[PDB]
């Protein structure tokens, strides 16, 4: 599902659609652009084909005719070129991954699609890029990226979470120690490491650090956010390293 900001597609603009049906003198295609508009692709504007005019195939079609009086459109599948379809399919893939993240978060947070894409797609459209990027940067510098675009913190953290109500992610860390209190000191690198993550990288659910070999161990990063997994995985194994490498404890990840 995709909800956009306008009623009928642009004049001469190219896009993608999902072919609903075919009759003898034309075909019904469903543009995923504006809530799934029904366009009449006529056979005068078309053209193995049994695979492009399928039952439920997504095809790349261009709009030629528009009528705002009744609110109808007429599109064309042939009048696409090759140097349009490429970038348009690329944006379509971005928008499909966006369909993924937003539909999954709205299926978690019991919200719908209309208000959803009114808060994500168009309150983030002021930010350059396809909104896939509008969280691809939210995950690298800080969560305040989504706050900067002006969206409320109701997609910000929860749509930040679901993407890629718990998720399982972990690693394996290898530790050596030589001190006289080597066990107190491994607990020391642990209980100096797992401190003040929840503020630098914000509210998550569960973390655990345990063993899988005798020197080969296992750390947990299991929260609402797999799209924060490595961020909450890698550096935190580091927050052991960064502390092991000043307490005579060799600590790394496998």
């Amino acid at each position: 599902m995709i909800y956009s900001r306008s009623k009928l597609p642009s004049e001469g603009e190219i896009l993608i659609a999902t072919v609903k049906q075919v009759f003898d003198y034309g075909s019904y295609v469903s543009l995923d652009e504006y809530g799934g508009l029904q366009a009449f692709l006529p056979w005068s504007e078309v053209s193995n084909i049994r695979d492009v005019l399928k039952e439920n195939r997504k095809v790349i079609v261009k709009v030629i005719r528009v009528d705002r009086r009744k609110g109808t459109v007429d599109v064309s599948l042939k009048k696409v070129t090759d140097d349009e379809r490429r970038k348009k399919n690329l944006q379509w893939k971005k928008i499909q991954r966006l369909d993924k993240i937003l539909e999954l978060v709205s299926q978690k947070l019991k919200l719908s699609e209309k208000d959803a894409w009114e808060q994500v797609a168009w309150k983030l459209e002021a930010k350059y890029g396809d909104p896939i990027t509008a969280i691809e940067k939210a995950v690298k510098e800080g969560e305040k990226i989504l706050i900067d675009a002006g969206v409320p913190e109701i997609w910000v953290k929860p749509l930040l979470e679901e993407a890629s109500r718990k998720v399982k992610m972990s690693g394996l860390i290898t530790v050596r120690t030589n001190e006289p209190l080597g066990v107190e000191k491994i607990k020391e690198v642990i209980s100096k490491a797992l401190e003040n993550i929840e503020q630098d990288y914000e509210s998550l659910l569960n973390i655990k650090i345990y063993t899988i070999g005798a020197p080969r161990y296992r750390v947990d990063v299991v929260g609402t956010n797999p799209k924060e997994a490595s961020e909450a995985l890698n550096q935190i194994i580091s927050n052991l390293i960064k502390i092991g490498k000043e307490e005579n404890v060799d600590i790394s990840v496998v």
Binding site: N178, G182, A214
Partner: protein
């Protein structure tokens, strides 16, 4: 109710394959010494095990069935609670030949020995000589000889082998080591066996004066699979104490312990720590006294200790001093025949640059000789051994057809 007393005596349970050894320690304790999966799956003793029990005697009843090892007298029909004497444990050795060296460790720990003979194998089996001379090199002449599995062998064949082994006694250090007939499974005559351990094998006079030394035999990472970081206990090193005693929060060093890289060459690092736990079976004691394997966990990381890494190492007080020599001298007198051998050839005297195996207390090494004299040698080792006393009992072997069979007895002059 019966006091909780740590064991004050060890007993070596040695013998050849299928003799009824682990089943003998089951006959005395009720528990077995096969603890690694392979030991069960192969059905033969590969490594040394452990098992524990008490001893109480019913002052009213006759001998010996009343000699039962639990707070009960009901087997002799009495209501009285028996007199407690001790808590008694054992060193269950292997019968195999590529696995002989192992029991030599335990030979330096036991305060006694129950040696088994097969009524139902051709006697004397070759390796029986090797066990007997193991006890004779280490010098625990206190021995109780037993004939086993007597339920398939008749009473006349039992008598014939009893005459064979009564003979095996005469002419050596063991002229009066007795033979008390038991069977290890059916729990027969085990009361007379306990009586024999008591009468003929008493615990030595203890020396609580020398620097308390702990002779490592095993060690484990008790940190189970899935152990989160809140409840991390240290790596347990288990053995038996022979001279001195250990206490809660004693400052010690493991010697030699780890290997580390030092000065462009190889060397070892002395492993310093504080004592955090000391266990005897399923009872918690705050002090460790000699007699019986004593497990001590400390503030050490169990990665250094799991899977019997440090096998046989020593551990002493962190204010002590022990000679650590990479190349050690030995006064060695050579055996007259190869004892565990099917066909006992002569001993081929040890010539220069040869490869030989040593077991020092519980620690083991391969070495090559550098200066060959008739009685004295100076051998270069792949690891320095810790020699806590003068002329310590090492046990020495040369390789025969792939099986390191002993060649003599040696003394390190420090």
């Amino acid at each position: 109710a019966w006091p909780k007393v740590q064991p004050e005596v060890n007993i070596g349970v040695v013998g050849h394959v299928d003799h009824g050894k682990t089943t003998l320690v089951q006959a005395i304790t009720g528990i077995w010494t096969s603890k690694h999966s392979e030991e069960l799956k192969r059905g033969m003793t590969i490594k040394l095990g452990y098992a524990e029990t008490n001893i109480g005697v019913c002052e009213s009843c006759k001998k010996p069935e009343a000699y039962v090892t639990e707070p009960s007298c009901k087997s002799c029909g009495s209501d009285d609670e028996p007199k407690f004497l001790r808590r008694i444990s054992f060193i269950d050795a292997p019968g195999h030949e590529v696995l002989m060296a192992t029991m030599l460790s335990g030979a330096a720990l036991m305060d006694g020995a129950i040696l088994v003979v097969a009524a139902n194998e051709p006697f004397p089996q070759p390796q029986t000589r090797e066990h007997f001379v193991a006890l004779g090199i280490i010098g625990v002449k206190n021995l109780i000889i037993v004939q086993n599995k007597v339920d398939v062998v008749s009473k006349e064949e039992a008598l014939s082998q009893y005459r064979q082994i009564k003979q095996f006694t005469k002419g050596t250090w063991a002229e009066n080591v007795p033979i008390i007939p038991v069977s290890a499974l059916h729990k027969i005559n085990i009361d007379s066996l306990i009586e024999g351990i008591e009468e003929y094998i008493k615990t030595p006079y203890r020396d609580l004066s020398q620097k308390p030394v702990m002779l490592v035999i095993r060690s484990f990472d008790v940190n189970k699979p899935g152990t989160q970081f809140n409840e991390l206990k240290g790596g347990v090193i288990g053995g038996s104490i022979i001279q001195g005693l250990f206490k809660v929060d004693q400052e010690i060093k493991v010697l030699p312990g780890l290997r580390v890289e030092k000065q462009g060459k190889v060397s070892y690092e002395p492993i310093f720590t504080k004592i955090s736990s000391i266990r005897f079976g399923d009872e918690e004691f705050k002090e460790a006294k000699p007699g019986g394997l004593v497990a001590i966990g400390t503030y050490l990381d169990p990665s250094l200790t799991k899977a019997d890494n440090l096998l046989g190492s020593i551990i002493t007080l962190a204010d002590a001093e022990v000679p650590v020599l990479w190349n050690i001298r030995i006064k060695y007198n050579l055996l007259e025949r190869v004892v565990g051998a099917k066909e006992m050839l002569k001993v081929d005297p040890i010539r220069a640059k040869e490869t030989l195996m040593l077991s020092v207390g519980s620690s083991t090494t391969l070495g090559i000789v550098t200066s060959v004299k008739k009685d004295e040698i100076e051998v270069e080792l792949r690891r320095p051994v810790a020699v806590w006393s003068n002329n310590i009992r090492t046990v020495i072997s040369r390789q025969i057809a792939g099986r390191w069979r002993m060649i003599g007895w040696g003394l390190v002059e420090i």
